[PDB]
Design a protein around this ligand. Structure first.
Ligand code: U5G
Ligand code: U5G
Lengths: 298, 301
């Protein structure tokens, strides 16, 4: 038993981190096969005009102590692709995926091509992430592991005025309405990921925390009206279906758990805690709860 | 900016995890150089786990009784010895993925990363703190025994914990890598209970300094306290006493923020009195005690 914010083992990703330098700017690169991927602002606003001026030897790529030889450079959206002469012998089985809001992933925070730490994040509904990044972390990546396949879903580019972070998928497309420019940008008003709070309440019941349960049930229509009041994301029938396994395992119907969440929103915790928390936690998806409460390995 | 419960990158540890089988019991082993370390209760049978004579049980075992599997490769055991509650299996192959490492025994309040494993395979990584009552609040299921706790400050893996058992409250108990349990626990199914736990005061102060570093100031106040008066108050909330050593180690964060340790102590007294009043500190509605002063410096600057 126990429930922790658990990240995926980062070993397969640590083997891909390299240091990329262009001018005075040093950040991280992701070395998969013979290509190094990094944020295009390493060359810094006309990115195609700035990239044309660059030679292959302008890009200094260092994989630990070894200097890699750049033999080509292209731009894909906000990501720079540096072709190198050596295929990374530590390239894991991998794919590039674009994630939806509410989905979680592990972040391997790096500085100068060296991994410093790993933690869990969720793609907020406002398309920002609440990460932990300092100067030099750009190029740090977010990922999930399924079986033996690493799915890369995020690359860090910038920090917004509220201390939250913005970045892209591994094809260079930003998550949210952000741009890689020094123009006024702000994170929109955020909402709570309802399906994730329900998954976390199921994890609390699995771990023997039951004070919030009740005899009541509700409808998807009545609950969604209450969710709207509290800046909660709408709960769809797909969400209800995804919660099916946890509902069957605990004997608590999804709309029964909705009545508990509704009462929790209108009345608060009343000094009580759930899984060592005084807030309703929304960064554990239904899959994360199953993956943890079942001990799935990679 | 931002503040997260951040674990160390687990790659150097994943390369040391193996599966160890003896009889019907299967758990994890830590393969460093030519030795595999695992909990000694892997040699126990269900018929005898209240009062096992481990010395007597180990003398009956042959090298071929221990099945060690590193992924697909079966390792050959060529020796076996016991060091306290840890079994050391000498194997014929040195682990080519052995990192630079050392065994360290940690003090209560110290934090570490746990690499939770099942059948020699890593499932996940998370942060833990050695509670003042010498238990850890981990996340472990059946098959997680032998999973280890570690820190990777400056490219050397310091192993500090190995998982052995779950207590009735859902909390966990284990040993250092020399086999010595943390706390008054024993590897026997006799009635055991975790003592009353307390909050790690020096860690809550470190976390309030991290909130100030990240721009949070609502909880500060004009008041100050003596160390003695702060401790008289904090014991009434089941907080650990704050020693002069704790005040000294908070020195760097105090100088960085311009807030004296005893002024931050006054802020914590007020927070204990009033609660948060619907506010939050670093995305939390409780006072967080699993970030040490060193962790705050690591993650902030
Ligand atoms: C990374 O590229 C890096 N070197 O690690 C760097 C990290 C930030 C976090 C501390 C320094 N990111 C940037 O330099 C990034 C590049 C410019 C401006 N960047 C910022 O993150 C800035 N934010 C910002 O301009 N925010 C808006 C656009 C005003 C909302 C900082 C002020 C935080 C430096 C670009 C291309 C976005
Ligand atoms: C590991 O060895 C393993 N196989 O992974 C296992 C932990 C698993 C089994 C449930 C969690 N540990 C034990 O089996 C451990 C070994 C016996 C009994 N153990 C327990 O953790 C038990 N707790 C327990 O007896 N607690 C006290 C002593 C009553 C307070 C379980 C009831 C959880 C199995 C020993 C030698 C302590």
């Amino acid at each position: 038993s126990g429930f922790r914010k658990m990240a995926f083992p980062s070993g397969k990703v640590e083997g891909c981190m390299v240091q990329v330098t262009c001018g005075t700017t040093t950040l991280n690169g992701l070395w998969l096969d013979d290509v190094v991927y990094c944020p295009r602002h390493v060359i810094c606003p006309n990115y195609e005009d700035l990239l044309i001026r660059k030679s292959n030897h302008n890009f200094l790529v260092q994989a630990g102590n070894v200097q890699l030889r750049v033999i080509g450079h292209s731009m894909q959206n906000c990501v720079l692709k540096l072709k190198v002469d050596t295929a990374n012998p530590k390239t894991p089985k991998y794919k590039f995926v674009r994630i939806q809001p509410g989905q979680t992933f592990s972040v391997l925070a790096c500085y100068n091509g060296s991994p410093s730490g790993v933690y869990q994040c969720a793609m907020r509904p406002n398309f920002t992430i609440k990460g932990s990044f300092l100067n030099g972390s750009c190029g740090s990546v977010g990922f999930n592991i399924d079986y033996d396949c690493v799915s890369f879903c995020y690359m860090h580019h910038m920090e917004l005025p509220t201390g939250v972070h913005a970045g892209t998928d591994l094809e260079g497309n930003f998550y949210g309405p952000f741009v890689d420019r020094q123009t006024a940008q702000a994170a929109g008003t955020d909402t709570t990921i309802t399906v994730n709070v329900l998954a976390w309440l199921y994890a609390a019941v699995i771990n023997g925390d039951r004070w919030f349960l009740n005899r009541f049930t509700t409808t998807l229509n009545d609950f969604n009206l209450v969710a709207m009041k509290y800046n909660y994301e709408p709960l769809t029938q797909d969400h209800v279906d995804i919660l099916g396994p946890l509902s069957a395992q605990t004997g608590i119907a999804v709309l029964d758990m909705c009545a508990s969440l509704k009462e929790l929103l209108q009345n608060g915790m009343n000094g009580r805690t759930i899984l060592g928390s005084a807030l309703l936690e929304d960064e554990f998806t239904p899959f994360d709860v199953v993956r943890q409460c079942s001990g799935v390995t990679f």
